[PDB]
């Protein structure tokens, strides 16, 4: 045998090494052919749905979801004990190749990596095809295919069309180095941006309390008041909450909602080249303000789905929705206005006029938290190559990288009906940021329900089916702001 | 000195469903008190709704002008219909402004008044950046949307430039 | 330390996150420190 089975976790100091081994099976895609694909192949009635590209016989390996590398215990042992983590070194191995014919033994499997990032990088878009979360499962390698420039369903002049080690006693391996990225924050701030003040002491700044003397004619006056503990809304502040792009509030109670379709028509979107795209998930904003937990922003969350759920028009219970409540300290709520500006000059003949900022780009002083990562969620994304970017961290969450983990392309060398089964052991190393807090009282952290139940969460049922009961998020620990 | 072979929104793999879901149907239809929240996979067949990591770059809308003198309005709007900034009570035309696609693809006759390979990562100069919900849709009133004419910077924006004074701060100092 | 390879996550200790008049293991408005509940040590699980 050309390799062994490695699954484990090694908790060492400030580092954690995770190793996952899975058995996989790779068929032939496109009958060893490359083929053009487009929207017209489906009929492509919507311009917003218009696309063009090619399907390839190649497969690829997507480990980009966290649940591949962390058992539910390890994710618990992690999130409760640490303020942050981030990958350092990647290591990948493809061993124990077996080739079949249709079933009898035989051939080579071609496999290679793109180190210079020349081929289209499709991993960071959160597609299915990930390694299975439960080590006993066997994951069929998903087909590779890509998209490029288009006009309607037709291609255009600039559109583009796109060496491998050959292998049954052979193996394939490489090592990969994560570039420096900041720790993905996993904590909730104890203080809210506007509560930073010392409640016991006055400010030396002033605010304007009275613009008139009383009731009557010709009452205009200027009266000022010390910004102080009794009135905390008016005090001067050095920093302001992060950017916002409003989402339509949706009531998770069916009755509260409007009795008409509003999915697309009332959705936020951004416009590119005449094609409108839903703004998803969008900038990081707290889902709901304290006191209402049942609402969620429309596309402002990552909506996963439960086991046995799939495809079209599933019920509400089926899909599981992530929660962004913790970032409510530094960030504006997703379905609420940023604030107010004045729309005019007050005259003696005209009252002041205000308006609701729906969206605000960056201003000096804006601080924010990025979107939390989930055990079921993606890990990294690929920063596009452009002239300039701002805060490259990806909008679904995770670590933005200009040079993220390379793709691993794979296909069978060709006909005879043929498929290849094999093994994969992938190893990522993570750096840990320890919890230094001096907080006196015990803090909220993940726990299983001790009460009796039919089944164990994160365990297989009587038919062997494995399921992950709820989205789990990193930020449980608390820092001072 | 180059152009992209991929649009910002098509970076997806066409052959694979995401594991992400969206809100497919607010209303069951044709009846009073008939509202149901159905969810659906984001996938290849519907490419507008999928979750995406990066959004196109900033915009400050330009007025539109066409080469054919008939398509244009029968009035002089050169100064009145111009996008400007106001500094010390003096109004200055915005020229050329930030980098934006000069026209939508397929339409070569229209050009920005003070303004095409950046079209993939950048909003067209004439077109609004997007929509924003302007209220809460809760039975009494249906959901509404506004039009965003200009959009500042947001985490996850990527953009192209066009093909430094002594100050406390500057962002993307590359000359306009 | 614990080398446990158990797959499903443990019972831990938590501070219930819900709006409350006071915080547990903190001081009330007169500064009287309070321990609201006894805390045992046994949460993590072992094999027999």
């Amino acid at each position: 045998s050309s390799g062994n089975w490695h699954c484990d976790s090694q908790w060492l100091g400030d580092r954690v090494i995770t190793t996952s081994t899975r058995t996989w099976a790779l068929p032939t895609y496109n009958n060893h052919l490359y083929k053009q694909i487009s929207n017209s192949t489906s009929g492509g009635s919507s311009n917003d749905n218009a696309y063009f590209g090619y399907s390839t016989p190649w497969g690829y390996f997507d480990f980009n979801r966290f649940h591949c590398h962390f058992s539910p215990r390890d994710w618990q042992r992690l999130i409760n004990n640490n303020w942050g983590f981030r990958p350092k070194r990647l290591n990948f191995k493809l061993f124990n190749i077996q080739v079949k014919e249709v079933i009898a033994n035989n051939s080579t499997v071609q496999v290679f990596t793109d180190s210079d990032y020349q081929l289209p990088y499709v991993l960071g878009s959160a597609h299915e095809g990930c390694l299975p979360p439960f080590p006993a499962d066997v994951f069929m390698i998903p087909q590779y295919g890509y998209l490029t420039l288009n006009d309607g369903s037709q291609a255009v002049g600039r559109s583009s069309f796109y060496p491998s080690q050959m292998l049954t006693g052979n193996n394939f391996q490489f090592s990969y180095e994560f570039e420096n990225v900041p720790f993905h924050s996993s904590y909730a701030h104890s203080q809210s941006l506007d509560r930073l003040m010392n409640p016991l002491i006055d400010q030396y700044l002033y605010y304007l309390s009275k613009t008139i003397n009383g009731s009557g004619q010709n009452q205009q006056t200027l009266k000022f008041s010390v910004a102080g503990p009794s009135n905390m809304a008016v005090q001067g502040r050095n920093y302001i909450p992060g950017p916002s792009y409003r989402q339509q509030r949706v009531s998770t109670t069916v009755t509260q909602n409007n009795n008409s379709e509003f999915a697309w028509p009332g959705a936020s979107s951004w416009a590119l080249n005449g094609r409108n795209s839903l703004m998803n998930p969008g900038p990081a904003m707290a889902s709901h303000k304290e006191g209402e937990d049942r609402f969620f922003p429309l596309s402002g969350s990552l909506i996963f789905g439960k086991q046995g759920t799939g495809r079209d028009n599933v019920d509400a219970d089926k899909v599981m929705i992530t929660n962004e409540e913790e970032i409510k300290t530094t960030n504006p709520v997703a379905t609420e206005s940023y604030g107010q500006v004045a729309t005019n000059h007050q005259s003696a003949q005209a009252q002041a006029q205000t308006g609701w900022v729906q969206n605000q780009g960056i201003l000096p002083g804006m601080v924010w938290q990025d979107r939390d990562v989930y055990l079921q969620g993606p890990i990294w994304a690929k920063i596009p190559h452009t002239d300039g970017n701002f805060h490259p961290s990806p909008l679904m969450g995770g670590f933005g990288m200009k040079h993220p983990p390379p793709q691993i392309l794979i296909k069978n060398t060709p006909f005879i009906t043929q498929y290849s089964t094999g093994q994969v052991s992938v190893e990522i190393e993570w750096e840990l940021q320890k919890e230094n807090s001096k907080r006196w009282n015990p803090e909220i952290q993940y726990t299983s329900n001790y009460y009796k139940s039919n089944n164990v969460e994160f365990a297989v049922n009587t038919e062997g089916v494995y399921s992950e009961p709820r989205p789990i998020g990193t930020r449980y620990l608390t820092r001072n702001l | 000195s180059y152009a992209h072979s991929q649009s910002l929104d098509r970076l997806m793999n066409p052959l694979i469903d995401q594991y992400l879901y969206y809100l497919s149907k607010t209303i069951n239809g044709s009846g009073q008190n008939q509202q149901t929240l159905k969810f659906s996979v984001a996938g290849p067949s519907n490419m507008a709704v999928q979750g995406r990591n990066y959004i196109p770059g900033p915009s400050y809308r330009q007025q539109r002008v066409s080469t054919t003198v008939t398509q244009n309005n029968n009035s002089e709007f050169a100064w009145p219909g111009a996008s400007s900034w106001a500094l010390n009570g003096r109004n200055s035309l915005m020229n050329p402004g930030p980098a934006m696609a000069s026209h939508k693809e397929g339409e070569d006759r229209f050009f920005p008044l003070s303004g095409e390979e950046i079209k993939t990562t950048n909003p067209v100069a004439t077109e609004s950046y997007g929509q924003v919900a302007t209220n809460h849709q809760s039975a009494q009133a249906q959901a509404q949307t506004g039009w965003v004419q200009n959009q500042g910077i947001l985490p996850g924006m990527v953009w192209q430039d066009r093909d430094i004074p002594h100050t406390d701060g500057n962002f993307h100092p590359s000359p306009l | 330390k614990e080398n446990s390879k158990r797959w499903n996550p443990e019972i831990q200790y938590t501070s219930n996150y819900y709006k409350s008049n006071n915080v547990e293991f903190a001081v009330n408005t007169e500064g009287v420190y309070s321990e609201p509940r006894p805390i045992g040590t046994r949460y993590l699980t072992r094999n027999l």
Epitope: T252, T253, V254, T255, D293, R294, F296, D315, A316, D317, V319, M320, I321, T322, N323, N449, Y451, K452, S453, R470 | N28, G31, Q32, N33, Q34, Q35, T36, L37 | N16, Y17, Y18
Partner: antibody, heavy 130, light 109 residues
Framework: VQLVESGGGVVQPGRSLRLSCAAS????????FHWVRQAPGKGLEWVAV????????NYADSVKGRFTISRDNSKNTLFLQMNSLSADDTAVYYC????????????????????????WGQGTTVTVSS | LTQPPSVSGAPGQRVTISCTGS?????????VHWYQQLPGTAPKLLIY???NRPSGVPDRFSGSKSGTSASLAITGLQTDDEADYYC???????????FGGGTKLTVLG
Amino acid sequence: VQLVESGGGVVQPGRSLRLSCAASGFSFSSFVFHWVRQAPGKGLEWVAVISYDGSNKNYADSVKGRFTISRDNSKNTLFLQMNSLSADDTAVYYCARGAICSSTTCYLGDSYYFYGMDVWGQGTTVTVSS
Amino acid sequence: LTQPPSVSGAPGQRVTISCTGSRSNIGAGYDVHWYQQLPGTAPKLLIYGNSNRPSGVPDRFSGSKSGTSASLAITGLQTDDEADYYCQSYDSSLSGSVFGGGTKLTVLG
């Protein structure tokens, strides 16, 4: 919006009678339904809870296995058929529709926790006596 | 989930009803929904959620949640407010909801 009941009668101990709830004026599919039983002098007792499309049903302890629940979506009807009635079951039965959710778990949106029953039915008296 | 067998108050006053609860019941943070029924009539949801009054409900009817025990404070007692109140909450161990033991408010006028 209306929720009714039917099927009540005089059972006598030991025999079964189906208990059906027909409902119109609201989408049948988008709401989760409950049955709640009330003895004459005793507080409301929650008999059963069935999710939308009827995929998952979790009975109360007392009635477990001696009741069943069937929800037919097409005719907008809720059917609770019971079995092996004793004289402890003599009481009204209210057809309920769950909507409101215990706050923190609303995002998971399970079949259970929708114990909020905004509106519910007229009830029917099922009397088990010899 | 246990309620007082009887509560009694005079018109024009402040009446309070409180249902103490177990860890399996209210420790989890599960919302506590209050119901009222005029006698011999179908019960009506009163305070959906921890403290919210739905459309078509009097402002005076207000209730809250603290610790394991929710409370409901009616202000400006009216004759129409004499009826049975019921505290429900989900119980984790049971895995099904548990209503309270029932209460009859007595308007003393």
